[PDB]
Design a protein around this nucleic acid. Structure first.
Lengths: 32, 150, 168, 196
RNA sequence: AUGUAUAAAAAUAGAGGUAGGCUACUCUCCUGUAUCGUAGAAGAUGGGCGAUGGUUGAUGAAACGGAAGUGUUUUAUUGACUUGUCCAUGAAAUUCCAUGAAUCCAUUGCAUACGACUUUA
RNA sequence: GCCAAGCGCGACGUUGCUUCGGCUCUUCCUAUCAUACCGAAGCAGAAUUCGGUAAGCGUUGGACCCACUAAUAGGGAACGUGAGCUGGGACCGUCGUGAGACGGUUAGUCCUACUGAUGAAG
RNA sequence: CUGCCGAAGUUUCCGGAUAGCAGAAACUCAGAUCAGUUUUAUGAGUAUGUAAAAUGAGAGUUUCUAGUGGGCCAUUUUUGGUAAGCAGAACUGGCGAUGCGGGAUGAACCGAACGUGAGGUUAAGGUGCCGGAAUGUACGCUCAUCAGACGAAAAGGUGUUAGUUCAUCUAGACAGCAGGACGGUGGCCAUGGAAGUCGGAAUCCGCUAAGGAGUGUGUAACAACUCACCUGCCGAAUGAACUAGCCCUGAAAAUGGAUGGCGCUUAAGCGUACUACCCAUACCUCACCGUCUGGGUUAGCUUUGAGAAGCUCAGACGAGUAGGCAGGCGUGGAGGUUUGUGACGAAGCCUUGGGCGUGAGCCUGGGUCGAACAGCCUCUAGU
RNA sequence: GUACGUGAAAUUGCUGAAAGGGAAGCAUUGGAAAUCAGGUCAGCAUCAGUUUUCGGGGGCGGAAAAAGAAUAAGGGAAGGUGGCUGUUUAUAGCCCUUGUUGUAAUACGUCCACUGGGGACUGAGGACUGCGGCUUGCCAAGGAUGCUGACAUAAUGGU
């Protein structure tokens, strides 16, 4: 089928927090 | 999803609907206003065919606050005879050459209600014309767009 | 479809500079509007000449003088990458300067995933002597006895009756 | 281009999904499709990768009556039918009627060994895979995951090839006689102006 | 359904032959837009000329097909048709598209919550 | 701290002493105790030690032990399995200094999987 | 039942007022004033504030009367930070009162804002099949025994592809064969001993084409082998350090499972370019409904079309919570009216009968039924 | 028929018709079957409105395209041909410049109040006015007519 051990496609909550992770990276670079 | 600043500017340009076109006299105040709403409109230099075909096919006059079609020369004479604009060709000449009464001629014209462009836009329509999109200034390519919307 | 455009421009005349210097660039763009935009970008980044203070005095498309003569073109470019600072030199064999630039843009976006705005072409030259060629694949093209079987042949009318020949 | 009421497709040398995608659309179009030699189908990717793909598929099972779990079919025709079935709206009555118009078999049984077998150029491995790319055969993949009739199909196919060759020689010999007698009639050169 | 027309095999960095002695020949491929078939009041009625074939219907067969052989031939007849090449009649106003067993009732206990199961009659 | 490829930091190196808690049960994970097979080591042999593949199969009986044992490996089912199972008050009032007690209200909330059994019917 | 208008979503003072947003009433105003806008000029610090052309729109006030006074999400600036989260403001946005196309599915993503329809064309996203639409065109990259389609980070890989720099190269490039790889010297200490290679310090030398106080194996120690470096045969490119792309790694356990699936490998993956194509309630044209706005309409002209509460022409518009306004449908009873309906069948009821209205509802055929009931105008309510 | 006027719905049995692979109801579009009202439905032509899809011809523009071809000068050479690894058109040729044929062509861009076809949807209004064109009249000019068919013992429109 896929041979992977995890679903490559994540959940909508998981991708939503990734944009939050991208927000954190902007916080680390710009201000933090 | 329009910022209030752009919404006010396009209200002054009378661009209250998508695919609506108007003629403007290009000057300092117009040039910078078009810069602010540049992502939301595309503008260019129209040639004589574009101006003539717009007024013949999509030309409507504002008479008694009513969108009256430019079906007869008497309509233009009754509304713009004070400025010696007696016929459609006189109205085209005033718009094309930007005569002394351009403001009265353009404000008399109802904004052109263009259709969707036959053949479509570019793939990403909301990028600048330079960046492969359709927004912003596009010089003489406004003509090719207009023949798509006529 | 890219086009080579000669763009000559200069700042608006003023009392301090009544005879401004006219700067010319040979730059490629799909249309004149893009070319004049790219010209202004390069002029600002080099001479610090503001677009408002300047003006475009001449725009002219340049056709290939010998579109039927196969040539080799060497292109120096300023590649923009993750670090955003890299210089590259590439050589393409074709009959038109526009074609070589088009191949250059396709190659860079393919190998290095570099966009049109990130890439800036520094100089395009025609390497007429075989010896100055630095690329082995190009040199193999300039060999006198170049001959090779056609690669990547691969050839509605669904449901063909017989099997494809896929050969000579 | 044009249809046939019943179409026999020689699956040898084809690609699983590419042939399945073409077949599924043809079934929806109201055509009847018979796919022969499903054990000779090819799949892009080396055997071990494709074997692991099948093993992962076999792994799907319930803790309550694995009979309620997915039924994993090992026959090469059943593997092809699974590929076609996933490309059809099979939960829908239209897709169900599409499936009943498909008949995928291993080898070429008698009712079809005497019928013409067309091929699909959009799915042929030689026209779709870069040379030097690893690929596997469904017959080998099936025989290594549980299919137990590879040899019987192989033996039966060898006999059919012998009988088919004998038929061709008789047909070829007959065609030569008509070919020789063709130029005997003068009319073929009298009015060959029409391109015939 | 509207011709419900078409059976080599394998290769694709090669095949198939013809003509030869696994080796010397040359030719063909480059898809089926091919080949077969196709004139006739859904296909009428006769007459020639020239084949001496083709297409079949009904019998009589013998050989072949087992993977799902339900079809392939070879035929011995008989009945038709033949457009292979020419002729002569007929056509319409439809006067502008529409189409013998098992079961119950009994019996058994190798079986059994009840059905079922195994027996016997 | 010393260096310190490099881009004032500066990696590896180097110096400095210093309520919870457990029975049964079901499966599953391998981060493997045993069983099977390999690799390394002064591995002579034997008994080992360490490291790989590996969850197929096991991983007890009694009170820190104990003996058996090939071995008595670690965990999950986020309130593991308490709907398999058991063990180890608040408000108000009153008297009140630095301090604690003597109350009135109070407030809880078929269907289907599985196991077998028949069974009409192309 | 239908139609029309339609917020606030919170300041500013003490739960109330003021104001804001929405209407109504009554005024004055079109040689006038406005504006979520941009220029020009002045100064002052690319911005700022003040004043004076562009564009658009008829612009103003007074009374008085409803509803509202939350939040959530996101961008940017900034204030601190902390293993890491984040925390505090401001800012205007989006939701909120709002359907629709796409994103497999979705409060916050991409498009787009809504009367009923016909046609055309698009946005966003797409064109292998599910699935409407190119198994399109062109140029590349990628093979994963856990590909891809969407922090764990410092790095590792004899994985591939382009480059950048520096090196040698007919004085013969590497690589491979044939060799040399020496003499003082076993240089000096050390000990069963170490003669380059137990070890500790030196690291000199003559000869060359070149040979170290030795690259490792070896030896009890030599010896022997080896390379550092040279020589010959051979005949051309070769090596080192970096950059970038893609590929593997750069941990995570506990029924089977997910680029949505099937599947896909010169893609149906990734990047780019170019055409064509698919369809939203969006855009265009048209018809119709409604609302608003503007114009016209009496010696009532033989065009007869004056229920003036009527007729007619034209244009624009159509989501809608709180709230506001208007017009209608239906029921019991009352006054009036219809020369009203009715045992030749009232009312009621039933019905895969018909018709009208956007709708509330109304009319009617057939059946059953057996004594009363309805239209219109007004009144009334236990509607 | 006193389980007694009328006799609704829920619900139940029966007969008829149909549907039914782990829900059903509903909406949209039609088909089938049944049943209702009872002019209908077609084809073409000539026009109007909107629209889509193929062509043809002709202006103008740019390096007044670039090329190119043919034909005269000169220059250079190769990925070196004939010749003899090395050379300079010979028994192949190529590159560069200039002249010429020239006002070459063509592509691309743009325009035509230039033109020829194919397709689809729509037909609002209802004496005459108006703006125009051709010449009292006629007209593609303030919104569709004409010519035929077939079919009513059915098509259409329903339910």
């Amino acid at each position: 089928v896929s041979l992977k051990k995890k679903s490559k496609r994540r959940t909508t909550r998981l991708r939503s927090r990734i944009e939050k992770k991208a927000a954190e990276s902007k916080r680390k670079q710009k201000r933090a | 999803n329009i910022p209030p600043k752009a919404r006010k500017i396009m209200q002054l340009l009378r661009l209250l609907q998508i695919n609506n076109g108007i003629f403007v006299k290009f000057n300092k105040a117009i040039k910078e206003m078009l810069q602010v709403v540049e992502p939301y409109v595309t503008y260019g230099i129209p040639n004589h065919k574009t101006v003539r075909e717009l007024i013949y096919k999509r030309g409507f006059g504002k008479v008694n606050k009513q969108r009256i079609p430019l079906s007869d020369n008497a309509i233009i004479e009754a509304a713009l005879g004070k400025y010696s604009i007696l016929s459609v060709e006189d109205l085209i000449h005033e718009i094309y050459t930007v005569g002394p009464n351009f403001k009265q001629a353009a404000n008399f014209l109802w904004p052109f209600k263009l259709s969707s462009p036959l053949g479509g836009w570019r793939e990403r329509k909301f990028k600048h014309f330079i960046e492969g999109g359709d927004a912003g200034k596009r010089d003489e390519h406004i003509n090719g767009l207009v023949q798509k919307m006529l | 479809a890219l086009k080579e455009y000669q763009v000559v421009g200069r700042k608006v005349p003023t009392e301090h500079e009544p005879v401004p210097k006219l700067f010319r660039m040979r730059l490629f763009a799909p249309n004149e509007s893009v070319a004049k935009s790219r010209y202004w970008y390069f002029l600002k980044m080099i001479n610090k000449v503001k677009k408002a203070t300047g003006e475009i005095v001449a725009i002219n498309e340049i056709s290939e003088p010998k579109p039927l003569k196969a040539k080799v073109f060497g292109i120096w470019i300023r590649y923009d990458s993750r670090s955003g600072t890299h210089n590259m030199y590439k050589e393409f064999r074709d009959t038109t300067r526009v074609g070589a630039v088009e191949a250059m843009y396709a190659d860079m976006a393919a190998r290095h995933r570099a966009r049109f705005r990130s890439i800036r072409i520094l100089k395009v030259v025609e390497v007429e002597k075989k010896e100055d060629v630095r690329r082995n694949y190009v040199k193999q093209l300039l060999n006198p006895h170049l001959k090779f079987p056609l690669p990547h042949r691969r050839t509605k009318k669904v449901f063909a009756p017989h099997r494809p020949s896929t050969f000579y | 281009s044009e249809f046939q009421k019943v179409v026999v497709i020689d699956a040898k040398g084809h690609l699983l999904g590419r042939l399945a995608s073409v077949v599924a659309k043809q079934l929806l179009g109201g055509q009847k499709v018979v796919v022969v030699r499903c054990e000779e189908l090819n799949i892009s990717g080396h055997f071990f990768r494709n074997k692991l793909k099948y093993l992962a598929y076999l792994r799907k099972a319930c803790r309550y009556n694995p009979s309620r779990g997915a039924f994993h079919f090992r026959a090469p025709s059943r593997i092809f039918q699974k590929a076609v079935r996933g490309m059809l709206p099979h939960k829908t009555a239209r897709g169900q009627a599409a499936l009943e118009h498909l008949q995928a078999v291993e080898g070429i049984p008698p009712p079809f060994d005497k019928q013409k077998r067309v091929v699909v150029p959009a799915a042929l491995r030689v026209l779709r895979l870069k040379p030097g790319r690893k690929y596997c055969t469904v017959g080998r993949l099936s025989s290594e995951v549980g299919w137990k009739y590879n040899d019987i199909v192989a033996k039966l196919e060898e006999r059919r090839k012998v009988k088919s060759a004998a038929f061709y020689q008789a047909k070829l010999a007959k065609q030569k006689k008509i070919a020789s007698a063709k130029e005997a009639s003068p009319v073929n050169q009298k009015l060959s102006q029409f391109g015939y």
